[PDB]
Amino acid sequence: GLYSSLPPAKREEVEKLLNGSAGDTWRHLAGELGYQPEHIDSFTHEACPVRALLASWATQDSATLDALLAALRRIQRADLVESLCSESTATSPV
Amino acid sequence: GLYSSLPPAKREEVEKLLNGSAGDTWRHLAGELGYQPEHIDSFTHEACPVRALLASWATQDSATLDALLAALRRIQRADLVESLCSESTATSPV
């Protein structure tokens, strides 16, 4: 299940979670994904580093939800896993 | 002078620079200011960590432009010193 296959309403909830609860888990994700520190600096160029990270990660087949969930586990952010499953409920594709 | 003594239009320009050009420089500042690593994570709870940093800095007498400039020099961001001084000639309080 590629992250790029999700509807825009699901991607907006990933932004809302880091905008409203804890905008800092993406640093830990980039660490366990093994991103070089120059990419972490390229993501902090914007106030929403999550939007740039998700768009940049979606360029490659590694962008599976299975890999995202494994990295979330390695950083002890199973709370974000639980929230993203509960917030998966939606109403339209657009 | 104290950063807390500036008009709100100047504080909006410090936010707009980190929101729109590059939002990394507050991390480098927090390092040379000698902040604890828990404060860095507490600021990144929000999308605009600069708004929370500037608020938690304005509550102490350490918030002088003289200290801000010394930190900006140590982090090799004298380009930002020029940009912020070049916007100081505003005439638009709120």
User: Which residues in chain A are contacts of B41 at CB distance < 8 A?
Assistant: 24
Q: What are phi and psi of A65, to 5 degrees?
A: -60, -35
What kind of experiment solved this structure?
A: NMR
d(CA B59, CA B70): 19
- DSSP for B68-90, please give it: HHHHHHHTT-HHHHHHHHHTTT-
User: Which residues in chain B are contacts of A49 at CB distance < 8 A?
Assistant: 23
Q: Would you call B57 helix, strand, or coil by DSSP?
A: helix
> Which residue, among A56, A11, A8, has the nearest Cα to A30 in the 3D structure?
A56
CA of A79 vs chain B CAs: smallest distance (Å): 15
Task: Find the CB nearest A22 among B18, B27, B45.
Answer: B45
Taking residue B2's Cβ as centre, other Cβ atoms within 10 Å add up to 14
Token pair in block for residue A86: 């509960």
Token pair in block for residue A72: 């979330």
Would you tell me the crossing angle of helices B78-86 and B65-74 to the nearest 10 degrees?
A: 140
CA of A76 vs chain B CAs: smallest distance (Å): 15
Taking residue B23's Cβ as centre, other Cβ atoms within 10 Å add up to 22
Task: Find the CB nearest B45 among A24, A46, A48.
Answer: A24
d(CA A24, CA A19): 10
d(CA B58, CA B39): 15
> Which residue, among B71, B53, B72, B42, has the nearest Cα to B15 in the 3D structure?
B53
CA of A27 vs chain B CAs: smallest distance (Å): 10
- C-alpha neighbours within 13 Å on the C-beta side of residue B84: 19
d(CA A66, CA A64): 5
Architecture of domain B1-94: Orthogonal Bundle (1.10)
Q: Would you call B63 helix, strand, or coil by DSSP?
A: coil
Kindly identify which residue of chain B lies nearest to residue A15, measuring between CA atoms.
B47
* Most B-contacting residue of A16, A38, A41, A44 (CB-CB within 10 A), to test interface: A44
